[PDB]
């Protein structure tokens, strides 16, 4: 396959996802460590539900419990273009990702790439369990 890519400017943030039917954490990742993290009360949710969340829609609760879940969601931006993409569990170079989405507007600047990444989830922000 290619030998690499090697784009001329690139910010990237890693936001795991933690779901338990207590609370969600939200990690916002740079080169392995949190830059970010804010928790919210748990509940209930489907897997479209899961991905809603992801995608930083407000989906339905459901009653019902289930175990911990790890959804991966990457925010790459080069000058001209912002990918969106969402895993169930970790990234894997094989692995579908369940959500994946390509923007036409790019940053000049990590600071207003990462205030565009935050606002997908402003209104979990808003429920944060520490304000
Ligand atoms: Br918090």
């Known amino acids: 396959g290619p030998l690499g890519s090697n784009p001329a400017s690139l910010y990237?943030?890693?936001?795991?996802?933690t779901f338990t039917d207590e609370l969600i954490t939200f990690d916002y990742?740079?080169?392995?460590?949190?830059?970010?993290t804010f928790r919210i009360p748990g509940?209930?949710?489907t897997?479209?539900?899961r991905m809603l969340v992801c995608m930083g829609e407000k989906p339905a609760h459901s009653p019902?419990?289930?175990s911990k879940s790890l959804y991966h969601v990457i925010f790459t931006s080069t000058c001209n273009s912002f990918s969106f993409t969402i895993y169930?569990?970790?990234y894997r170079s094989w692995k579908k990702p369940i959500h994946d989405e390509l923007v036409d507007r790019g940053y000049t600047t990590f600071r207003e790439?990462?205030?565009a990444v935050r606002g997908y989830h402003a209104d979990y922000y808003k429920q944060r369990l520490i304000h």
């Open 12 to 17: 990237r943030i890693d936001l795991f996802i």
């Open 29 to 36: 990742k740079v080169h392995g460590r949190p830059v970010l």
């Open 43 to 45: 509940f209930g949710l």
């Open 47 to 49: 897997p479209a539900g």
């Open 64 to 66: 019902f419990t289930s």
């Open 88 to 90: 169930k569990g970790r």
């Open 113 to 115: 790439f990462f205030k």
